[PDB]
Structure 1
Amino acid sequence: TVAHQITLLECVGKGRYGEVWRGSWQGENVAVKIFSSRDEKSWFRETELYNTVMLRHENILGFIASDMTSRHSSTQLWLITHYHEMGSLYDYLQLTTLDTVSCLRIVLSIASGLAHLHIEIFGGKPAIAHRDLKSKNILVKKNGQCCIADLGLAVMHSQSTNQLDVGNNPRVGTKRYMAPEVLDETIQVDCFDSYKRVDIWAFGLVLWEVARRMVSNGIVEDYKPPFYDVVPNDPSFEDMRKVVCVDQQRPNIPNRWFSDPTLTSLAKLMKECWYQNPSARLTALRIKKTLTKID
């Protein structure tokens, strides 16, 4: 009596995350994520968050329902959300280039969702950090704004209790996007601010991925993932620690940015998301204000 009301129409992805299907519910398109059997803790955390918190914002993936169902005679865990036909930012950036307006609309919309997650509202949601932000977890909507998905690693904090709720999930972040303090295990795990600073690091990487695809002086970079030149596909913990902690590498700023105002303003933001000192990074709210101002 939720799963039963839904028809899986097509599988639009299969990976370590499980599967994502386009489905119909009352004849309306929905996305259905089917969690891998190894990943009940991500389903549990996401269902806990979207059910217990008023988590609703233009730039956060819109929750509809969570259910358990039997298929091929075993338990499947479903998360059911709005369907975005364009798919992920990761796929979008491969199939197309951006003008100034569409590059800024994308990165401002991501900053707006991230600032909404990071801020505690009273009277209402706790502060939330994401902990696995990446271009593959961000969906592009038909208005050309984005929405953030995949809250299964999220951490919450309430000023009322000054309680940090870190959950019970053995899953770790996407290795490519892990901040230095995560890779070297120096992150201060009892301070909520540590988790928000991990998201700013990842946001910087996504800003880099997007800016590369904005046309300036008639030219543009091909899509590349962060650190494409120094680590393999599916990089290991050790691959990433060598690069980010030991060599202290950062993605290169291309040369053709430096005489463009928009891209100089974006390159400034990304460097201030990437300080090795977490405390020195900008906040999501500071990022959102600055992008509101850029032309």
Structure 2
Amino acid sequence: GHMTIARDIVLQESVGKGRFGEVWRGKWRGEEVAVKIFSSREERSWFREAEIFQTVMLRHENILGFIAADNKDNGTWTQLWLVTDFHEHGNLFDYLNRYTVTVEGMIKLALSTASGLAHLHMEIVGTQGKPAIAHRDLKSKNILVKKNGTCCICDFGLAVRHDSATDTIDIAPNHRVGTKRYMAPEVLDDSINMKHFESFKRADIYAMGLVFWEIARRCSIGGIHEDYQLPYYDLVPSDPSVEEMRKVVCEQKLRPNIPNRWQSCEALRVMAKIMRECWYANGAARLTALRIKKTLSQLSQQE
């Protein structure tokens, strides 16, 4: 018995929930693991996320480490499990709400997020390669902060994979699946072309620029920083509808405000420029995750 299995895992603490499935801190052969638990009626969601997590060549330091998909029968009902590495800090949302970061801290968070997304989006051609994956629900609540102060992306149930040979998407995607606040303009107004996989990669970039805005607010220089806020906190209610978002992002064409103090620091200037270049209404004009990783790597080298 070498491989990690459900019957050997002991749940210790409930830590949160996804759209479906509750996340627990568990102990497996003396080590901490995260267990995402789904009910029998949530099999499709569980299966889909296990399917994404099992994608060939997916493992990357900035992608949540998958361990196993399993079942657990308690004698009354069956639970469907997704076991992964456990990241004590939780999500970027929790971390940024609790702490401010330095210039170095900010670049580590932004660069690691961009590196994970670049790896996700990257297609390695051939049967022994890797299909391109688009997240479709990227947000600060879906990005985990590791002990070393770097990020890893989780919550892949809404993801879509591209097959280069057939030039097709592995599923028939439903429209407007993600978090309304982070939905790209083309997703909000339904102009998105669901037949082109590049559309999904471009909508993930938009959401990442919003996440960078959340990080940059918390970068403290000389003890000066902004308070924690979700993007569009100044324009929409909590739990905004698609129409509330669409009126702001598409009709009025507003983006989160870029403060005057971000022009005073080079790291903040580079971050502010990436943001504007992720926020174009035209998806084709946005930066790629690979290009962002390259720009931030250069900035990390220099600092």
Q: How high is the TM-score relative to the length of structure 1?
A: 0.94
Instruction: Output the amino acid matched with 2:291.
Output: R
Counterpart for residue 109 of structure 1: 112
Structure 2 vs 1, CA of residues 171 and 275 (structure 1 numbering), >3 Å: closer, same or farther? Answer: closer
Residues 180-219 of structure 1 aligned to structure 2 (within 5 Å):
180-219=185-224
CA distance in structure 1 between the aligned counterparts of 2:69 and 2:236, rounded to whole angstroms: 36
Matching residue's letter, 1:157: H
- C-alpha change, 1:204 and 1:171, in structure 2 (3 Å) is closer
Q: Which amino acid aligns with 1:220?
A: H
Q: 1:31 aligns with which of 2, 18, 34?
A: 34
Cα separation, 2, equivalents of 1:68 and 1:92: 32
- Counterparts of 1:58 and 1:284 in 2: how far apart (Å)? 16
8 Å CA contact retained: 2:173, 2:194? no
Q: Residues 168 and 80 from structure 1, CA distance in 2 versus in 1: closer, same or farther, beyond 3 angstroms?
A: farther
Aligned to 1:172: 177
8 A contact 2:136–2:203 mirrored in 1: yes
Tell me what 2:63 maps to.
Answer: 60
Q: Do residues 267 (structure 1) and 267 (structure 2) align?
A: no
C-alpha displacement of 1:169: 6.4
Distance 1:36 1:191 in 2: 34
| Structure 1 residue corresponding to 2:86, chosen from 83, 86, 93 | 83
Structure 1: distance between partners of 2:174 and 2:57: 22
Unpaired runs of at least 5, structure 2? none
Structure-2 separation of matches of 1:190 and 1:118: 16
Query: Shift of the alpha carbon at 1:36?
Result: 6.1
**Partner AA of 2:120 in structure 1:** L
TM-aligned CA deviation for residue 15 of structure 1: 5.7
Distance 2:255 2:202 in 1: 16
Is the deviation greater in 192-201 or in 47-56? 47-56
Distance 2:41 2:262 in 1: 43
Structure 1 residues 204 and 73, CA gap change in structure 2 (3 angstroms): same
Aligned residue for 2:45, secondary structure, equals helix
CA distance in 2, matches of 1:250, 1:13: 30
Which position in structure 2 is the counterpart of 1:244? 249
How many angstroms does 1:241 deviate by?
Answer: 1.2
How many percent identity over aligned positions? 64
- Residues 36 and 277 of structure 1: CA distance in aligned 2, closer, same or farther (over 3 Å): farther
- Equivalent of 2:286 in 247, 271, 281: 281
Cα RMSD (Å) of the superposition?
1.9
2:18, 2:155 within 8 Å by CA — same for their partners in 1?
Answer: no
Structure 1 residue 97, shift from structure 2 partner: 0.9
CA distance in 2, matches of 1:25, 1:221: 40
Question: Is the CA contact (8 Å cut-off) linking 1:16 and 1:36 kept in structure 2?
Answer: no
Query: How big is the shift at 1:204?
Result: 0.3
Match of 2:158 in 1: 153
SS at match of 2:208: helix
1:236-263: CA deviations, max 9, x gaps? 1111111111111100001211211111
Deviations 1:166-187 (A, max 9, x none): 3566881111100011111110
Going from structure 1 to structure 2, the CA distance change for 1:90 and 1:287 (only over 3 Å counts) comes to same
Distance (Å, rounded) in 2 between the aligned partners of 1:41 and 1:265: 41
Bigger mean CA deviation after superposition, 71-80 or 257-266: 71-80
Note closer, same or farther for the CA distance 1:52–1:102 as it changes in structure 2 (3 Å cut).
Answer: closer
Q: After superposition, what is the alpha-carbon deviation per residue over 1:110-133, rounded to whole angstroms, capped at 9, x for unaligned?
A: 100000011111442111111111
Which residue does the alignment assign to 2:148?
143
TM-score with structure 2 setting the length = 0.92
Given that 1:272 and 1:281 are in contact with CA atoms closer than 8 Å, whether structure 2 keeps it comes out as yes
